[PDB]
Design a protein around this ligand. Structure first.
Ligand SMILES: [Cl-]
Ligand SMILES: [Cl-]
Ligand SMILES: [Cl-]
Ligand SMILES: [Cl-]
Ligand SMILES: [Cl-]
Ligand SMILES: [Cl-]
Ligand SMILES: [Cl-]
Ligand SMILES: [Cl-]
Ligand SMILES: [Cl-]
Length: 225
C-alpha cells in the first residue's frame, strides 16, 4: 500500500548523518580524514548530468567489445568485459555503473588490494568494497568475500553485482545518492564513508555515457520532506 519513502526533512537527515560516532570521511592532503559537520551537510545537498540521481537498476546496451574498451588498461579488470555483462544480465545491474564502481574502488584495476588476499591455498578478491576486506578479516573468516567464496576475479565481479542487487537495489536504494545517503533511513545501510563516493563513480559513468551515446534512465531529485 504505502510506497512513500520520503520520511525526513533535510535538516533532520543532516543531524542523523552528523550523529555520534558516525564516520564520514573526505580526501585531503593525499589521504582520508574525518569530514566536519559543514562538509557532510554540503555533500548531501541535492544539486555530472545528474548521474548520482539516475536509476542504475536497469540495463544498458553495451556489447562485450564496448565494455572491454572501457576496461582496456585497467589492470586486473582488463579483458573481463564478458563477465561484467554476465553480471548485468543475471542481476539487472547497469554495467556502466558496475564498471565505474569497480574502477574507483580498485584504482583503475591496479591497486595492490585488487590482487586479493591469500588464505591457505586460495586467494579472495573484492572489487566493490563489500564488507571487511583485509588480512585479519580474511584470516578470521569475518570477511564477506571469504564467506561467499570469491576465489577469482570473475567470481568477485558476479558476486559484487549479486550483492548490490540483493542488498541495495532490493532495499529501494536505486541510485548512487540513495546508496550513499539512504534518505529513507538516514545514516543506516550506507555504502561508504567517503562523502564524495557518489561523485567519483558518477563522473566516470558520465564520461562513459557520453563516449558511447547512452540514454539516461529515470532521474529522481526529491528525497526529503
Ligand atoms: Cl561484442
Ligand atoms: Cl572479456
Ligand atoms: Cl564482512
Ligand atoms: Cl535501510
Ligand atoms: Cl552525493
Ligand atoms: Cl555534454
Ligand atoms: Cl541507450
Ligand atoms: Cl528533496
Ligand atoms: Cl515547498
Amino acid at each position: 500500500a504505502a510506497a512513500n519513502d520520503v520520511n525526513y526533512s533535510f535538516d533532520e537527515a543532516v543531524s542523523m548523518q552528523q550523529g555520534k560516532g558516525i564516520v564520514q570521511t573526505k580526501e585531503e592532503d593525499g589521504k582520508f580524514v574525518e569530514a566536519n559537520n559543514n562538509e557532510i551537510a554540503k555533500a548531501m545537498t541535492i544539486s555530472d548530468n545528474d548521474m548520482k540521481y539516475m536509476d542504475i537498476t536497469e540495463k544498458v546496451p553495451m556489447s562485450e567489445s564496448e565494455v572491454n574498451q572501457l576496461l582496456k588498461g585497467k589492470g586486473i579488470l582488463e579483458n573481463r568485459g564478458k563477465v561484467f555483462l554476465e553480471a548485468q544480465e543475471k542481476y539487472e545491474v547497469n554495467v556502466i555503473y558496475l564498471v565505474s564502481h569497480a574502477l574507483v574502488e580498485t584504482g583503475n584495476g591496479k591497486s595492490e588490494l585488487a590482487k586479493g588476499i591469500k588464505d591457505g591455498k586460495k586467494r579472495y578478491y573484492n572489487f566493490f568494497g563489500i564488507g571487511a576486506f583485509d588480512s585479519s578479516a580474511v584470516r578470521s573468516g569475518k570477511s564477506y568475500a571469504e564467506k561467499e567464496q570469491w576465489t577469482s576475479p570473475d567470481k568477485a565481479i558476479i558476486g559484487g553485482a549479486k550483492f548490490i542487487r540483493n542488498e541495495y537495489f532490493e532495499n529501494n536504494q536505486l541510485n548512487l545518492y540513495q546508496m550513499r545517503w539512504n534518505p529513507e533511513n538516514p545514516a543506516q545501510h550506507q555504502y561508504a564513508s567517503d562523502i564524495r563516493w557518489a561523485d567519483k563513480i558518477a563522473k566516470l559513468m558520465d564520461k562513459s555515457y557520453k563516449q558511447f551515446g547512452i540514454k539516461k534512465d529515470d532521474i529522481r531529485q526529491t528525497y526529503y520532506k
